[PDB]
Enzyme design. Structure first.
Site, PDB file in Angstrom:
ATOM      1  N   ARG B  47       0.635  -1.238   0.086  1.00 41.58           N
ATOM      2  CA  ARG B  47      -0.028   0.085   0.015  1.00 41.58           C
ATOM      3  C   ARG B  47       0.374   0.964   0.081  1.00 41.58           C
ATOM      4  NH1 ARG B  47      -1.447   1.439   4.424  1.00 41.58           N
ATOM      5  NH2 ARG B  47      -2.429   0.058   5.026  1.00 41.58           N
ATOM      6  N   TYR B  99     -16.277  17.100 -15.467  1.00 48.71           N
ATOM      7  CA  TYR B  99     -17.140  15.716 -15.835  1.00 48.71           C
ATOM      8  C   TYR B  99     -17.830  15.664 -14.978  1.00 48.71           C
ATOM      9  CZ  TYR B  99     -16.332  10.610 -15.833  1.00 48.71           C
ATOM     10  OH  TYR B  99     -16.890   9.329 -15.245  1.00 48.71           O
ATOM     11  N   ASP B 171      -6.710  18.551 -15.177  1.00 51.77           N
ATOM     12  CA  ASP B 171      -7.125  17.168 -15.588  1.00 51.77           C
ATOM     13  C   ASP B 171      -6.645  17.472 -16.961  1.00 51.77           C
ATOM     14  OD1 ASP B 171      -8.568  15.059 -16.370  1.00 51.77           O
ATOM     15  OD2 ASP B 171     -10.010  15.081 -15.097  1.00 51.77           O
ATOM     16  N   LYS B 196      -8.725   5.922 -20.314  1.00 52.46           N
ATOM     17  CA  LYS B 196      -8.579   6.675 -21.447  1.00 52.46           C
ATOM     18  C   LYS B 196      -7.110   6.526 -21.964  1.00 52.46           C
ATOM     19  CE  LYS B 196     -12.244   7.368 -18.662  1.00 52.46           C
ATOM     20  NZ  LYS B 196     -12.765   9.000 -18.251  1.00 52.46           N
TER      21      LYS B 196
END
Ligand SMILES: *Cc1c(COP(=O)(O)O)cnc(C)c1O
Ligand SMILES: *Cc1c(COP(=O)(O)O)cnc(C)c1O
Ligand SMILES: *Cc1c(COP(=O)(O)O)cnc(C)c1O
Ligand SMILES: *Cc1c(COP(=O)(O)O)cnc(C)c1O
Ligand code: NA
Ligand code: NA
Ligand code: NA
Ligand code: NA
Ligand code: NA
Ligand code: NA
Ligand code: NA
Ligand code: NA
Lengths: 380, 380, 380, 380
Positions: B47, B99, B171, B196
C-alpha cells in the site's frame, strides 16, 4: 452446509457463459451496449461494476451472511469509504487501541473534514455508553485488537448502537468470517483488510465490506463509484482463489496457536502472553461466546529490545516482515515497527514494552513452529 | 530527446536486478527486512509503495516533466486524493462543464465535508478572478472539456492561482502528456484518468497524478497511504505497457480527427461541430498556444434523437460504449447517456441537444473511419 | 523439517532484490546485457530461462528431493519432453492402463517417429522383466493409475530399470510429492500434470519434471529449449501459490476419502470400490510401503448408466467436469467420458462398466461430502 | 476494410456474454458440463481449447487470411508442431540460413526421429527443385532471413510445393501479417514467433500458426492437444493486446528503417548494408512483389569486433539484448551472440564478419534513432 463447504460453493465464482469453473478475469474498462441504455448483463463501466469484482463481492457477502459486498483497493480504502457515510459535525467512537492506519486516517485526514473522533476502551461496553454524544453517528470496533488482542463484546455493542441510532461497524480482519460473523450479532457493517488472512498469500492488497442493510449498501455503492477506491480484476481473482483455502489455513493456524501458547507460557524467558484463548485473558468468555476459533496473532513479552532482536535472529521459520495472515509465520517488534513514534514512557504504560514481540502464525508444521520458537527462546 | 523516444526510454521501466526489459509485476503485499527498519530497496508494504506502481509513477512524472508521480485505482480516486488536500471551509473553483464524475464527487461527497464548490465559465479567466473568495484554496480545470470541448487558458490560470495563493490543478486526460504539459505552464498538479488514452486499450481503470512540488507530493503521498486508493501491480504494468504506444496512437488519432472534421463540416446532415482544431472555436488560439496536437473526442449535432440512433446503427466501425481513448472508435449520445438526469430545456440551453453525438476517434484506418461515418450520415 | 514446513520454505520463492515475499511475475521475453555475453543474473531469453519459471522449478525439485526442475505448458508437454529423450528404434514399456493422453501421444504421435511402445500390467513387476527387449530404453509407470487405481511397485521398478539400463520415469500426479517421492526410491525422472493437485485450483494447465541426474537434466533442458513447450510466468506464479496449500489440501482430501470409502462399502447401491486404501486392493501393501497417504480419486460401481447419471443429478456438492485435484469435488463417468471410443465389450472386460463412477474428492466439509453422496445413492 | 481497421476489428476479441470490449482472461483449466457430453460453449478442458487462446487464434487466422489459428507456448513450439506433421523417413527442405533455433530443433532433435533435412539456398527456387527427393514432404522457408535478410520467392515456392506434393510452410516472423501474407500466395501453413513483432512489447514468448487447409488444421489440432505446447490465457491476452498496435508500430519502424539505411549507406565507417529495401539487394524485386513493406531488422558491416563493441557502447537509444520486434531498438553482434560456435573462417565465408552488427529498429523518434546511430559511428 458446513463452513468448509460454504467456502467452496458459496458466492458466484464460475462462468455462466462458458462453464469455466473459476471466475474469468475481466481485464476491461467498458462494455458494448446493444442499444443505448441496454446492458447485456448489467455492466457498463468497470469502476461502477466489474464481473470479477462482483464475484469477490458475492463471496464476502455470502461468507459474512450479508446481502451486499464491496471490494476496495485496500483495507484502509474500505475504512475510508465507511467513514464517508458520515458528515461534517458527526462523531465516531472507536476502540482505544484501533489499528494505526485507522487511527491515522481518522485523526489526520477525516478530522480535517469535521468528523469528530473519540477513542474509548470498549472492553467495557458502558464506556461506549458514557462516550456517546448527541452528535455520535458511528461505533467502530475491532475485536480482537492489535497487538494486545483486546476483546470487545460485539452483541452488546450492536445493542448499544441500535438503541442510540448509531451505524455499527466491526473490523473483522483478525478473526475472518470463518470464525466470527458480526452481521449475525446485529452489527450494521463488517469489513476486512483482505490483504491479511482472506487473500492469505501476501500477494494482494485489498479491502472487503459486507452489509445486509439495503440503504447503507446504496450509500456505500455511491461512495465507491464516486471516490473510486475499487479493487482491480486481477486482485479480485486472486482474492477469490485465496479464500478457497481459508478454512484449512485457519484450522492449521489454530492448531499451531494452541501449541505455541502452551510453550510460551511454560518458558522462563517469556513473561506475559496476550491471546484471547488464555482463560485469564480479559473478556475470554465474551470471545468464546461470539467466535468459534482464534486469530493467529499472538503477542508476548521477552526481557528487552536485544532479547527481541536475538529471538528474531535465532528462529529458522519466523520471517521478519510487516502485515499478518501469510502462509509464512511472521515476526515483528511493535515498539520498533508500529509504535516507535509514541514516547517510550507512554509505550511502557500502554504495555508496548521494548521486549514485546508479535508473531502471526502461518501454516508451517506445528511441531516445527513450536520447536523453532522454543530453541530460539532458549538462546536467551 | 523527441517525444516518441521519451515515451520509450523515459522513466524506470526495466529490472535492475535481472535486466528484464519490462517492469516485473510485483504481485506481493510485504517485503523481507534484513534487520528491523532495514529495507533492501526501500519497500516495506505494498500500500505504501510497490515496485511496479513505482515504475508507472516514474513514467507519468517523466512524461509531464514533474518530479513525483502517484497511481490511483481510478481517475476519480486521483481527483478525490487531490481534493483531500483541502480542509472543511475551503473553497474550490472548477470549470462549469467539468466531468460528471468530478461534479458528483464534489457536490455529493465533499460538500458533506464542508468543501465549498463554485462552477464558473473558465473560458474567460477573469471569471476565475471574480469567483475567488477569501476561502478559495484550489483552482481545478479541464481543458478541453467534455462534451463540447471548451478550452481554458492554462498559463493564465496558473498565473491567477499563484497571485491568489491557490493550488492549481489540471485534468489533462483529453490531451495526454503527448500534446499538453500543464506543469510546464506553472500548474501545481496535473492528473489523468489513465483509463482513457494512457492505458489506451480499454482494459485498465486507473488514475495518475504528477507534480514538481515536494510539499504537495508529501501531502499526496500521505493521503494515498492513509485512504488507500492505490493502483495494483497488474494494472500498473498494463499502464506502462499501453503508454509505450501513446505517441503512435495519438498521431494516428489526430490524422483521422482532421479528416473526419472536414467531412462533418461539409455534410448537410450535420450542423454544429465542436473541436478545438476548428478555427472559429472559442479559444482556438489559446489551445494552439498551449498544446501541439488535439484530443480525439469530437461532438457534433445531427437533427434529433432518432437521427443519432440511426447514425449509431448504420456505422460499421464506431462502437456504442462508455469511456474514450480506446483503440476502437467509440460513439455515444450525451443527452441520453451522461446528461439524461438534467431537464430537457436546461440541456437544450446548455447545447446538449437531443441530436448531439460524441465520438472518440480510435486508431482504425483514416479512410475507413471517414467513409463509414459519411455513409452512415448519408442514410439520414 | 516436516512436510508442511518444507512446502512453505522449500525452494526459492522470494525476491532477493526487493525482499518481496512472493516470486515476482517476470512478464518479459528478454534481458539487458551489460556487455556482450555478460548476464546480470544468468537470464538472457525467457524461453531458455525465466525467473518466475525458475522459482517453480526450484520448488518442484525441492519437494521431490531432486536437483533439477522443469516446467512445461502442460502435463502432456512434460511427457513428450521426457519421451524425446529416446531415438527412433528405441522401445518404451508403460503400464497397461496409463492415462489416455499418454497412450495417445505414444501410439499416435511418437510411433510415427519410430518409438516402439509396449503396454504391460506392471502390477506384477516380472511382467516388466518379460517385456524387456534389447531395444528397450525407458520404463514409464503411473501409480496409482486411472480410473481403477492400480498400484505398481516403484522400488522394484527402479531396480529393474537399473539392472537393464533403462531410464525410469514415474508419473506422480495422483499422489503428489506430499505423499510419494519416486526419486527417493531410485527412479530417474518424476513428473506431474501440475494442472491437477499441485496447482490445486483448476486455473493452470502445466507440467512439472524433476530429476537428480545431471546428464538427464542437461538433455531435458536442451529439449525444452529446442521444442519450446515452456510454462509462462503468470502460470508459474499461480503454481507456486497453489503449491503453498498442497499439504493442507491433501490432508483434508484424505480425511474425506477415508470416510467416503466407509460409506461406499456399506451402501447397498454400490458394488466394487477401487482405491489403494482398501486392504483387499491388489498391492495395498506395496502402496503403503511407498507412500504415506492417498490420492483423492476413487472409482466405484453403481448398477448402470442411468444410475450413474441419476447419482450425478442428485448430488449437491459433486461437480460434473473433466480433470481432478480441484478444491471442488468432481464427478465423472469414464465409460462415457474417457473410454467411450473403446468397444463396450472390451470396456466391460477391462472393468470400465457402464455404472463405473469416478469422483475426485475436494476440500469441502467431510460430513457434507459423505452425506451428499449417500443421499444421492439412496435415491437409486 | 483497410489494414489498420482489420487490426482493430478482425477476429473475435470481445465478450459476447457481458459485452466486455476486451477478451476475458480465462485463467481456468476445466468447464462445467450441464449433461455428460453437453458443453455450454464447446469448452471442456483448457489444453484442448481455452476461450482466451481461441481469441488470439481467431486474430491470427483473420490477419493471415486463413481459416484456422493455433497458439503455442513459443515460436519453436509452433515449428516443432508443424514438423511433427511428418513421419520417420520424411525429408524437409529449408532455406540455408534458417533461424538458429529452427536449425537446432531439426538437426539435433527431429533427425533422431528419422526426419531428414536439407538446407538449400532458396534465393534461387530451382535450388529447391534440385534438392527434392522422392521422400521430400515439406518445404520450409523464412523470408527475409536472419541476419543477412535473404529473400525467397514465396509464390514460386508455393507452386513448386504444389507440383511435387509438398506441405509448404513460411516463417513470416520478420514481415508480420501487416506486410506479407503467404497464405494468399498459395502457401499451406504460415507461422510466427509472436515473441517478436506481434506481441511487440518484449513481454510474451509465444508462437502462432495459421492455415486455410481443413485437413492440416485437424492434424495440427491433434498434435497440439497430444503434445501440449499450448499458449496460456494470460499470454494469449497480452498477444491480442499487442497486436492492436501492430500496424502503427510497423509503420513507425519502416519510416525509421528508410532513414537509417540512407545514413548507413552514406557513412564512411560502414561497408555493406543488408536489407531488402536496397535496390541492389538480391531478390529486391521479388520482395517488393510479395510484400508491401519492410522488416525492421537491418545488418551492416563495421570494421571489426572492437568497432562493433564501441558502436554499442556509444549509442544512447540502442539496447544490447537478444530477440527483435520490441518497442525499443535492439542491437547485437551475430558473430559473438548467435554464430560464435561456428568456426571463424566459415563465419567469414558466410558473411558473418566480426564487425557485422544487427539492429532491430524500434518505435523511438526517427531523427533520434538516425542521429544517435550516426554519432556513435562517428566515434569510430
Ligand atoms: C451450507 C451452505 C450455506 C448455508 O449457510 P449458513 O452458514 O447455514 O448460514 C450457504 N451457501 C452454501 C454454498 C452452503 O454450502
Ligand atoms: C529526450 C528525453 C528527455 C528530455 O525531455 P524534455 O522533453 O526535453 O524535457 C528525457 N528523458 C528521455 C528518456 C528522453 O529521451
Ligand atoms: C525440512 C526441510 C527440508 C528437509 O527436507 P527432507 O524431507 O528432510 O529431505 C528442506 N527444505 C526445507 C525448507 C525444510 O523445511
Ligand atoms: C476490411 C476487413 C476485412 C477484409 O479483409 P481483406 O484484407 O479484404 O481480405 C476483414 N475483417 C475486418 C474486420 C475488416 O475490417
Ligand atoms: Na458457488
Ligand atoms: Na441487523
Ligand atoms: Na527507461
Ligand atoms: Na511551478
Ligand atoms: Na523458500
Ligand atoms: Na537414483
Ligand atoms: Na472484432
Ligand atoms: Na492454398
Amino acid at each position: 452446509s458446513n463452513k468448509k463447504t460454504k467456502l467452496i460453493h458459496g458466492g458466484h465464482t464460475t462462468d455462466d457463459y462458458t462453464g469455466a469453473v473459476t471466475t474469468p478475469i475481466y481485464q476491461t474498462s467498458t462494455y458494448l451496449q446493444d442499444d443505448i441504455g441496454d446492458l447485456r448483463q448489467g455492466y457498463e463501466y468497470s469502476r461502477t461494476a466489474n464481473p470479477t469484482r462482483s464475484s469477490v463481492e458475492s463471496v464476502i457477502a455470502t461468507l459474512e451472511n450479508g446481502k451486499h459486498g464491496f471490494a476496495f483497493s485496500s483495507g484502509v480504502a474500505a475504512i475510508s469509504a465507511v467513514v464517508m457515510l458520515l458528515d461534517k459535525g458527526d462523531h465516531i467512537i472507536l476502540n482505544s487501541d484501533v489499528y494505526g492506519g485507522t487511527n491515522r486516517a481518522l485523526t489526520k485526514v477525516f478530522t480535517r473534514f469535521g468528523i469528530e473522533v473519540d477513542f474509548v476502551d470498549t472492553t467495557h461496553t458502558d464506556s461506549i455508553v458514557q462516550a456517546i454524544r448527541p452528535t455520535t453517528k458511528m461505533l467502530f470496533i475491532e475485536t480482537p485488537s492489535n497487538p494486545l488482542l483486546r476483546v470487545t463484546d460485539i452483541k452488546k455493542s450492536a445493542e448499544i448502537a441500535k438503541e442510540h441510532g448509531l451505524i455499527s461497524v466491526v473490523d473483522n480482519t483478525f478473526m475472518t468470517p470463518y470464525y466470527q460473523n458480526p452481521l449475525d450479532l446485529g452489527i450494521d457493517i463488517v469489513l476486512h483488510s483482505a490483504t491479511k488472512y482472506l487473500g492469505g498469500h501476501s500477494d494482494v492488497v485489498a479491502g472487503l465490506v459486507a452489509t445486509s442493510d439495503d440503504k447503507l449498501a446504496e450509500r456505500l455503492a455511491f461512495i465507491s463509484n464516486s471516490t473510486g477506491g475499487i479493487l482491480g480484476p486481477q486482485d479480485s481473482y486472486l482474492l477469490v482463489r485465496g479464500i478457497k483455502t481459508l478454512g484449512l489455513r485457519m484450522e492449521q493456524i489454530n492448531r499451531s496457536v494452541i501449541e505455541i501458547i502452551k510453550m510460551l507460557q511454560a518458558h522462563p524467558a517469556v513473561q506475559q502472553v496476550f491471546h484471547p484463548s488464555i482463560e485469564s485473558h480479559l473478556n475470554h468468555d465474551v470471545h468464546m461466546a461470539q467466535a468459534d476459533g482464534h486469530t493467529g496473532v499472538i503477542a508476548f513479552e521477552v526481557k528487552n529490545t536485544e532479547s527481541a532482536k536475538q529471538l528474531i535472529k535465532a528462529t529458522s521459520y519466523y520471517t521478519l516482515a510487516e502485515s499478518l495472515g501469510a502462509v509464512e509465520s511472521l515476526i515483528s517488534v511493535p515498539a520498533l515497527m508500529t509504535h516507535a513514534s509514541i514516547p517510550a514512557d507512554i509505550r511502557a504504560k500502554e504495555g508496548i514494552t521494548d521486549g514485546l514481540v508479535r508473531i502471526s502464525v502461518g501454516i508451517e508444521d506445528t511441531e516445527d513452529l513450536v520447536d523453532d520458537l522454543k530453541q530460539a527462546l532458549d538462546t536467551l
